[PDB]
């Protein structure tokens, strides 16, 4: 399976406003994806988590979602 960073550009991990690329790092639900599927380093993941939370509070990223087909 593909990891998120593998298929992506040279993007800002500190931009909480870019929903287009921050959406890639959320799961089918609103959960933040682990490092196994994001292909990020520890520091990169630690920054991405805070930026994702920032975007969530701004109503840009979903706090949680609903699972399908279950």
């Amino acid at each position: 399976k593909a990891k998120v960073k593998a298929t992506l550009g040279e993007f800002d991990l500190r931009d909480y406003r870019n929903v287009e690329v921050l959406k890639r790092f959320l799961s089918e639900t609103g959960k933040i994806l682990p490092r196994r599927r994001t292909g990020l380093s520890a520091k990169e993941q630690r920054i991405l988590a805070k930026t994702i939370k920032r975007a969530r509070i701004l109503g840009l990223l979903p706090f949680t979602e609903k699972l399908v087909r279950k």
């Binding site: 609903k66 699972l67 399908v68 087909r69 279950k70």
Partner: protein, 116 residues
């Protein structure tokens, strides 16, 4: 006396019971059923067969209301949490989609001693 022709179906399954509430597209319920609505009384209500019978009885009451297309919502875990959806699929109601919307907190409340 409603002629709803389409709606949602919520399956609330626990380890002590399974109940199905069939509702309209904007949330108000139409019919419902459970392991106690049908004959079973005690722990027998938590068996997958009771869940199947409850889903089927609720689906037939929905037929009495005139239900054809159904969207499924699932909350909780227990024996027959899936059997309810299987019977609901083969009940004669065209299943639109199945969704698991089990409510999980963000670590807000302290559980009972059983749950720690």
């Amino acid at each position: 006396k409603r002629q709803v022709a389409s709606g949602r179906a919520y399956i609330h399954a626990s380890y002590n019971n399974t109940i199905v509430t069939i509702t309209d597209p904007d949330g108000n319920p139409i019919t419902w059923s459970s392991g106690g609505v049908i004959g079973y009384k005690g722990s027998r209500k938590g068996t997958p067969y009771a869940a199947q019978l409850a889903a089927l009885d609720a689906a037939k009451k929905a037929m009495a209301y005139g239900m054809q297309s159904v969207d499924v919502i699932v909350r909780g875990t227990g024996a027959g949490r899936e059997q309810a959806i299987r019977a609901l699929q083969a009940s004669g109601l065209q299943v639109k989609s199945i969704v698991d919307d089990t409510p999980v907190p963000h670590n807000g409340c302290r559980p009972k001693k059983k749950f720690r």
